[PDB]
UniProtKB/Swiss-Prot annotation, chains A, B:
The keyword Nucleus does not apply. GO terms for cellular component: extracellular region. Alternate disulfide bonds occur in equal amounts in all variants examined. Under physiological conditions beta-lactoglobulin exists as an equilibrium mixture of monomeric and dimeric forms. Interaction with LMBR1L which mediates the endocytosis of LGB has been observed in PubMed:17991420, but not in PubMed:23964685. This is Beta-lactoglobulin. One of its GO terms (molecular function) is long-chain fatty acid binding. Belongs to the calycin superfamily. Lipocalin family. Transmembrane segments: none annotated. Keywords: Allergen, Disulfide bond, Milk protein, Retinol-binding, Secreted, Signal, Transport. Primary component of whey, it binds retinol and is probably involved in the transport of that molecule. Disulfide bonds join C66-C160, C106-C119, C106-C121.
Length: 162, 162
């Protein structure tokens, strides 16, 4: 409840498939800082289960290898908000998406709002879509982001973006 | 700052080596519930770096395998409290330890105290030490724990305790 953009009428069945983390932004430099930074994760695929949940397939630099992890986000009463389990009460929010080109989403710990916000711009193809980045930035001006990363085509095709 | 027991005069150099998670307890059943539960981790070795930090070598059921993870807890101004990095502002506290037999410690998210407290009883050998369990329970009565797990010798020698 910091993110004032929520998508009306989300059909998670339609966000299924292949995705590229084109841009990232966080409210804290230390969350996206290095490759081994805690929330520096790359989305590979979004898989919605028939129950209504959302299996997230991402990549992250855990050790000194591009490890593949599988997170599952359970649906809540609100169709655009999902829950990820732990000691950390993290919510996932879908801000906007046309299903065919991009998807904007943020993640925040319910307890530490300002200290856990991380948002990304996901695109279908490994191209630099300017229109998507505009919408991403627009949704971002209202939030306290302090670091913004952007990736190029070549990097998008590499595991963990090199 | 919920845990009223802190160890005076901790020498982390002396807690180096092999350890067994003999008992676990959390304030929430859902943290220790299943094998795949978020904070159901098993300690293998504690390795203090010369800088003063503490490399933690544990095991956890992440996928459907007993995966080995390596967490590093950075020292703080207080010699018995350490910090683990993420969106979650987790502190590690050493409550008591004789260095030779046991070590009692708890973990808590600074933001969500009551909702993240997890404590364990670590012992040097894969035996059931009654004296350790007494001290563990004593330190535990003052806290809001809602689940308490205890392991047997046979399980202590298995990866992920079976």
């Amino acid at each position: 409840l910091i993110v004032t953009q929520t998508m009306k009428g989300l059909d998670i069945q339609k966000v299924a498939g292949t995705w590229y983390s084109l841009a990232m932004a966080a409210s804290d430099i230390s969350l996206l800082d290095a490759q081994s930074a805690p929330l520096r994760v790359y989305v590979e695929e979004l898989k919605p289960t028939p129950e209504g949940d959302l299996e997230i397939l991402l990549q992250k630099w855990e050790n000194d290898e591009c490890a593949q992890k599988k997170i599952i986000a359970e649906k809540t009463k609100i169709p655009a908000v999902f829950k990820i389990d732990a000691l950390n009460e993290n919510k996932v929010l879908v801000l906007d998406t046309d299903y065919k080109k991009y998807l904007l989403f943020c993640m925040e710990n319910s307890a530490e709002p300002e200290q856990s916000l991380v948002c990304q711009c996901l695109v279908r193809t490994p191209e630099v879509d300017d229109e998507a980045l505009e919408k991403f930035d627009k949704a971002l001006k209202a939030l306290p982001m302090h670091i913004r990363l952007s990736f190029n085509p070549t990097q998008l095709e590499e595991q963990c973006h090199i």
